[PDB]
Amino acid sequence: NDDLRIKEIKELLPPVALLEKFPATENAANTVAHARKAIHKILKGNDDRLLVVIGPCSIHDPVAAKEYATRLLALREELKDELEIVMRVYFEKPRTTVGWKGLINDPHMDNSFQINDGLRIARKLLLDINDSGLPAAGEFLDMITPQYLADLMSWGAIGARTTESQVHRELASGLSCPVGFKNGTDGTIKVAIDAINAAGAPHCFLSVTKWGHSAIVNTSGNGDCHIILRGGKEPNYSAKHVAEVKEGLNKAGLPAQVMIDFSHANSSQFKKQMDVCADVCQQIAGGEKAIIGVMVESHLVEGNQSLLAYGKSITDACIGWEDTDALLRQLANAVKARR
Amino acid sequence: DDLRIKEIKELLPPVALLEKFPATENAANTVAHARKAIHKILKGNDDRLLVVIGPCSIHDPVAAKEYATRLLALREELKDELEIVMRVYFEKPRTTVGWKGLINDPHMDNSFQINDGLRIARKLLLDINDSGLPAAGEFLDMITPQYLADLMSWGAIGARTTESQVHRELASGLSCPVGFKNGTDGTIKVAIDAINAAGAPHCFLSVTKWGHSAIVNTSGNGDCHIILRGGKEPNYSAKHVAEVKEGLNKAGLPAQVMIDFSHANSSKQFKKQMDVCADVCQQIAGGEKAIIGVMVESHLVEGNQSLESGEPLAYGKSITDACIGWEDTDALLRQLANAVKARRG
Amino acid sequence: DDLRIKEIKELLPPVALLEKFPATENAANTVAHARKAIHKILKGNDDRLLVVIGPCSIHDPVAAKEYATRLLALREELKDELEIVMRVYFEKPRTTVGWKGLINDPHMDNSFQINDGLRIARKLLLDINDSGLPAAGEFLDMITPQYLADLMSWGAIGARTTESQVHRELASGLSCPVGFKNGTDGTIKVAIDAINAAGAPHCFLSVTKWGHSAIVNTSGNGDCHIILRGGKEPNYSAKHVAEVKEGLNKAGLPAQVMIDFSHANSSKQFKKQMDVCADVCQQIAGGEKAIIGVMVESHLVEGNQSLEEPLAYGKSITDACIGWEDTDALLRQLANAVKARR
Amino acid sequence: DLRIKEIKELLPPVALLEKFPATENAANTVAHARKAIHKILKGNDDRLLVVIGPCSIHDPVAAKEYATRLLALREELKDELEIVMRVYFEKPRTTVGWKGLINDPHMDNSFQINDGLRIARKLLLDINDSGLPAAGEFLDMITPQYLADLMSWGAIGARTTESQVHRELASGLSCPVGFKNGTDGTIKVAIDAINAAGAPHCFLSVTKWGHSAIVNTSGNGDCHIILRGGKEPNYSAKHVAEVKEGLNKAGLPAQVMIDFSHANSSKQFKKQMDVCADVCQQIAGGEKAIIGVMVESHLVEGNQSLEPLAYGKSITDACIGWEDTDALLRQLANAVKARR
Numbered sequence A: 001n002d003d004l005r006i007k008e009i010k011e012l013l014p015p016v017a018l019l020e021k022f023p024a025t026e027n028a029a030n031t032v033a034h035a036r037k038a039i040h041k042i043l044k045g046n047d048d049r050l051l052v053v054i055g056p057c058s059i060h061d062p063v064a065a066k067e068y069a070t071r072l073l074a075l076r077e078e079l080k081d082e083l084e085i086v087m088r089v090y091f092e093k094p095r096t097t098v099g100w101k102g103l104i105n106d107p108h109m110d111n112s113f114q115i116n117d118g119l120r121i122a123r124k125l126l127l128d129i130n131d132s133g134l135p136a137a138g139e140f141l142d143m144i145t146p147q148y149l150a151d152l153m154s155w156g157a158i159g160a161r162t163t164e165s166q167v168h169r170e171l172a173s174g175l176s177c178p179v180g181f182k183n184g185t186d187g188t189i190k191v192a193i194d195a196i197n198a199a200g201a202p203h204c205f206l207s208v209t210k211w212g213h214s215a216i217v218n219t220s221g222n223g224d225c226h227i228i229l230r231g232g233k234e235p236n237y238s239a240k241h242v243a244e245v246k247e248g249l250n251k252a253g254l255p256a257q258v259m260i261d262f263s264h265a266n267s268s269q270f271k272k273q274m275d276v277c278a279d280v281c282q283q284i285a286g287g288e289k290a291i292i293g294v295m296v297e298s299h300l301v302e303g304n305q306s307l308l309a310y311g312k313s314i315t316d317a318c319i320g321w322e323d324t325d326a327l328l329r330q331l332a333n334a335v336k337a338r339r
Numbered sequence B: 001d002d003l004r005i006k007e008i009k010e011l012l013p014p015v016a017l018l019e020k021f022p023a024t025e026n027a028a029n030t031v032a033h034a035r036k037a038i039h040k041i042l043k044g045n046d047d048r049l050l051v052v053i054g055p056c057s058i059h060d061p062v063a064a065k066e067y068a069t070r071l072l073a074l075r076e077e078l079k080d081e082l083e084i085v086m087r088v089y090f091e092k093p094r095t096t097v098g099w100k101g102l103i104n105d106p107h108m109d110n111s112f113q114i115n116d117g118l119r120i121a122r123k124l125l126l127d128i129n130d131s132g133l134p135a136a137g138e139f140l141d142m143i144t145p146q147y148l149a150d151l152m153s154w155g156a157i158g159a160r161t162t163e164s165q166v167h168r169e170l171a172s173g174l175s176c177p178v179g180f181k182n183g184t185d186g187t188i189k190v191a192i193d194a195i196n197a198a199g200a201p202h203c204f205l206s207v208t209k210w211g212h213s214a215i216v217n218t219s220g221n222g223d224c225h226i227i228l229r230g231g232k233e234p235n236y237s238a239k240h241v242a243e244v245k246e247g248l249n250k251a252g253l254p255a256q257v258m259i260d261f262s263h264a265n266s267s268k269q270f271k272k273q274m275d276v277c278a279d280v281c282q283q284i285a286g287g288e289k290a291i292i293g294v295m296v297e298s299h300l301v302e303g304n305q306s307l308e309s310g311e312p313l314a315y316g317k318s319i320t321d322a323c324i325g326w327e328d329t330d331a332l333l334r335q336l337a338n339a340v341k342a343r344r345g
Numbered sequence C: 001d002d003l004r005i006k007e008i009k010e011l012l013p014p015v016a017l018l019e020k021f022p023a024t025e026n027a028a029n030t031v032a033h034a035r036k037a038i039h040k041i042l043k044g045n046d047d048r049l050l051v052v053i054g055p056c057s058i059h060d061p062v063a064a065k066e067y068a069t070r071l072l073a074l075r076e077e078l079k080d081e082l083e084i085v086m087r088v089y090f091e092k093p094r095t096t097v098g099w100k101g102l103i104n105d106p107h108m109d110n111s112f113q114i115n116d117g118l119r120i121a122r123k124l125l126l127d128i129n130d131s132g133l134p135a136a137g138e139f140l141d142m143i144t145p146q147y148l149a150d151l152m153s154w155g156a157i158g159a160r161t162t163e164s165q166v167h168r169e170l171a172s173g174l175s176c177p178v179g180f181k182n183g184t185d186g187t188i189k190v191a192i193d194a195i196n197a198a199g200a201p202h203c204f205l206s207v208t209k210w211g212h213s214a215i216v217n218t219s220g221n222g223d224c225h226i227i228l229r230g231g232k233e234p235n236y237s238a239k240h241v242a243e244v245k246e247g248l249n250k251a252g253l254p255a256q257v258m259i260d261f262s263h264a265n266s267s268k269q270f271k272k273q274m275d276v277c278a279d280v281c282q283q284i285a286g287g288e289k290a291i292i293g294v295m296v297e298s299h300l301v302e303g304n305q306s307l308e309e310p311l312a313y314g315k316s317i318t319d320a321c322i323g324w325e326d327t328d329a330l331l332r333q334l335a336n337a338v339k340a341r342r
Numbered sequence D: 001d002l003r004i005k006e007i008k009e010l011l012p013p014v015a016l017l018e019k020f021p022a023t024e025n026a027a028n029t030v031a032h033a034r035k036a037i038h039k040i041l042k043g044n045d046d047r048l049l050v051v052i053g054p055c056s057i058h059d060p061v062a063a064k065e066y067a068t069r070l071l072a073l074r075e076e077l078k079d080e081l082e083i084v085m086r087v088y089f090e091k092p093r094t095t096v097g098w099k100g101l102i103n104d105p106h107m108d109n110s111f112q113i114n115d116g117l118r119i120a121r122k123l124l125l126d127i128n129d130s131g132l133p134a135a136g137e138f139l140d141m142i143t144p145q146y147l148a149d150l151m152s153w154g155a156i157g158a159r160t161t162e163s164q165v166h167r168e169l170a171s172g173l174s175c176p177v178g179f180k181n182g183t184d185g186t187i188k189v190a191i192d193a194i195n196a197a198g199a200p201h202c203f204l205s206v207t208k209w210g211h212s213a214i215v216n217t218s219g220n221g222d223c224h225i226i227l228r229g230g231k232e233p234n235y236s237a238k239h240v241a242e243v244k245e246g247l248n249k250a251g252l253p254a255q256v257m258i259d260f261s262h263a264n265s266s267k268q269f270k271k272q273m274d275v276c277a278d279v280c281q282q283i284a285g286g287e288k289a290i291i292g293v294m295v296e297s298h299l300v301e302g303n304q305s306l307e308p309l310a311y312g313k314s315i316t317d318a319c320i321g322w323e324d325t326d327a328l329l330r331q332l333a334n335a336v337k338a339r340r
């Protein structure tokens, strides 16, 4: 009574294959370690600096990403006294129903699903970027792919559609990096507050080891978890909403910190991310220590592409690079003000 | 990695449980007949009502089997009006933390004796199917289905994972029909998207019956439907059914629904499923053909009790959501059967 | 790669056959007690003879169980003289090619339903042990022992594999005592060489109960010994035992032998096993204390038959065996020869 | 488990194959070599096949020093000798001992077998990428999946010619395989294994993924005998003649590889030159049945026991030095010119 609806089953490389081929260098290992220890500090109250997770919405061209990482690394070491810069290196995309799920799931973007390649491309891109000294951040959607990338990851996000799901709260509970939970698409805070609490508890569940086998896995629990404001049916980045989310966090016994995502439902329109910036910057300038981080969808070329132009996102519309240089400067100064 | 991964333990692969507990001939009949029976209802070629009914969670095989024996007697007595499937749920999703079900923690004490769990779960599923009674479950975990899916005639994606891509993927290659719940706030769109997503073929990483990860390709599942489970308010009434029916048609899908009488549709008041039932029976007996199914939370004894006390538990009583007891369950099933008869006619 | 490999098919992992067919308590006691009794015979502290006796190969579980029932009766009746251990050999090695046993081709038709074979083999092994009769097998390949070795109270390494590093490694990790047969030349050297190696600890690649390759480290097996099985000519005579007693001291291991009444020692004539028995008995009845064991090819029905129709019940389709009547007489002769040595 | 002490984990072949893929180059080294040994084996190349190199490999630097020297001779004697280097990673013992690089890469009994494979696959990949074919003993059942794609010719140990699992292995190997006569210096055991290895088999093995599987093989037609001596050597044109008839009687081509070392050598490494003279006389005398030759050679003559180690010197069987090696191969190349 098995596998009427399973078409084909193809061999998949275990993580140790991707680990052996592409070990972490000394630089990669250290970039990761330090950014993780930093975001801990910024999260336990002991750094006025602002974490800036920024980069494209999805990666499809490893050359464009390599160029972007080049540029962003300049301002990372430039603004290091106010900002903690981390690059958006997003290989998995959650679809409302149907479509391209990203570089790992379909690297050639032709529904060829040469996943084994996608795992090579992604791991090498992630390793090279960490070797620059640029730390990386991704969304953890699949339960199996993290074993190939998690050691190259300084920070992670759970997507708005899976924030309530127990299997992702289990995953978060065992990641060695800090984790952020987006509010519900229904705008509200509670499912992300439950998720933080769930992901801080020890969990025991079924996962796949570095060998590609199934096993029983115990996790310690992840205390480095925080909310990510992303908007609802209307945006929720305003100074009213922050204070709302602070009380809500204090009620639920959790640190009153927040990361505001300039994009998605918070900009309804990529240009609007810039208006969120001033609004949010006014708050950070005007003594608002509750904002511990920010999320921006930025690429080389602004705008959006569909299914082929260079350095332009094929998923969400991003701000181009000129705008990106401006935005990172407003942030480091809002931080300068607060300090 | 493994900074926050405390400990790793060996897990029996699916083929081990399958070899230890193969479907008997009758068990496999039960699974095969129930799936086609449901598929026929979903296609509109049967005026009968699918009824998924039983404990919120299984924590004691002894009372699970006592309950299955009583349900099977009614399933045979009423089979011209109802297609009775017992809730046999081994996975429980929590708002934050708590007991995640019999598989994850069979002895109910954070021993996490998962191999035992799979052994107890599959033997129980086997015993119930061999007896003639089909089983339903929530598909919550990405790895447990390989151990149990061939003894499952129907599954549910829970309200907290309906929007989850991996859950929509899992349903697209499941052998059985699958119901998708509206969102914990009462949102119909997530579930309709879920049905469309699950109807489509997918390609994604999963774990095989050999316990090894692999690239799997699915054909899509056509036997998917919405479940109305309440939001802020209940959404079982005529008014809401009409909205869901219209929104299915507007999305190009058959306008048919299963209504859960429990959870938010009862405001978590177990006796209120008797009132959801009265209203829903009247809709059916009055001519509503879109109600193809209902779900009820039922046990041997009504109410519930809490593991977390530390006392030894009463027999045959839920340790999760409160359920109606057996006497109410028998009456509910007869009303449902009677309403289906009246709809005929 | 794999220009000469045509197909790869899936293989049930050991843990799946251990879960379908777990040892019963009875079966596990059979293996525990038997393993222990043999180890005590092998170090001197028991004068009984160890008798490994049964079919050349199992091709039919039904006749095998009838054989076990009859053999079990005699195990009890002679237990003060004989430690009776049923030959349950699945895997068979061949000089050219041919049916490699029940595990490899249970349906005896070149279908290679190995999963079925392992299911049948473990089921049969489990039943025989569960009834109280301990079993002995040959270990030929490296992957199958995980599926069966927990129901094995004694083992043998093939005459064609006694010089094998891979086979001496395996013997070092086994929980049962293990005999090594002399070379097809009939020379004894490689046997002792193999008893020394198996006694040492080893580290080698092997498969786990999970069907995965892993690195394994073995303690080493000190319950090993030679099996005399002839060469160019039979080598069971008292003069031959003398030469091998002498060589076993020259190497510093206990001067003991198991004598195989079959194969080269009977010139491949199943009836001649009765003549080997008479000669060995007079050695035992002669005070020869260093003969610790015997191996007999025995079945319900003497002789053999070829594969082509239904077959004869209880009659070997590999090597010719003695039938039950001679089996009963030959075991009584061996018992009385034990009584005489005391 | 009573006699099992520990179960460490093990990279699956596909991990080694992925960190250390075959270069375009190394892929051609093996493709041509394999096809060359095949053409020589189908009686179709006046040339001899010398399998020459250390008894065992225990130092990848000393070893690729050796290799780069022997690549030159391969380039020079290219018209008389198909030269193949002896890259042996696994050693069968007569009881206990050091099983070679893979089992114990640091010779300290720590059994870092995961490093052993990494080291070994790196070495082979290099020697092959430079242009030089490789050869080894196939003793273990699990190791072949890490290394075989860089093996041009393989040998089955003399203490394993009679073992079913090794005949089974050879039936699936993609390279040609030689079978040593047994230690009893007798030839039937090898003749059987040649027939066995040519047939399809079906048996349990392990995949590139580290999983137990059921495997069917096609059979191996590129197999031959290796004369290795017994209680006395067997390289004589008399012994050769005896094997030729016995092999014709068996339906196999009368063809022979002569191993100059081990029992043929009286196990005295310097005698390999005596055997080399006498074997050359046969190749000179038009003898077409000697298709290949095996010699144990290293940078420096002799052997040593297990305190650090003399560079260049075998840790197992004593071998001849490099200059004796150079003269031996030109000795061999000349006799092929005479035959031609």
Ligand SMILES: NC(=O)N/N=C(\C(=O)O)C(F)(F)F
Binding pocket: A057, A094, A139, A157, A158, A159, A160, A161, A182, A230, A264, A265
């Ligand atoms: N971080 C991302 O780009 N993801 N986008 C989202 C997701 O989680 O799907 C969103 F915030 F819109 F919900």
Ligand SMILES: NC(=O)N/N=C(\C(=O)O)C(F)(F)F
Binding pocket: B056, B093, B138, B157, B158, B159, B160, B181, B229, B260, B263, B264, B321
């Ligand atoms: N059947 C169950 O107990 N599940 N309950 C639910 C779930 O799907 O979690 C609910 F309906 F509340 F959404």
Ligand SMILES: NC(=O)N/N=C(\C(=O)O)C(F)(F)F
Binding pocket: C056, C089, C093, C138, C156, C158, C159, C160, C181, C229, C260, C262, C263, C264
């Ligand atoms: N014990 C067996 O049945 N097999 N024994 C032999 C074999 O390898 O056939 C032997 F060589 F001893 F005759």
Ligand SMILES: NC(=O)N/N=C(\C(=O)O)C(F)(F)F
Binding pocket: D055, D092, D137, D155, D156, D157, D158, D159, D180, D228, D262, D263
């Ligand atoms: N071929 C080698 O270098 N090792 N030695 C042998 C082998 O077993 O192959 C030998 F011939 F000595 F037995």
Ligand SMILES: [Mn+2]
Binding pocket: A057, A297, A315, A316
């Ligand atoms: Mn986006």
Ligand SMILES: [Mn+2]
Binding pocket: B056, B263, B297, B320, B321
């Ligand atoms: Mn419930």
Ligand SMILES: [Mn+2]
Binding pocket: C056, C263, C297, C318, C319
């Ligand atoms: Mn026999």
Ligand SMILES: [Mn+2]
Binding pocket: D055, D056, D296, D316, D317
């Ligand atoms: Mn040597």
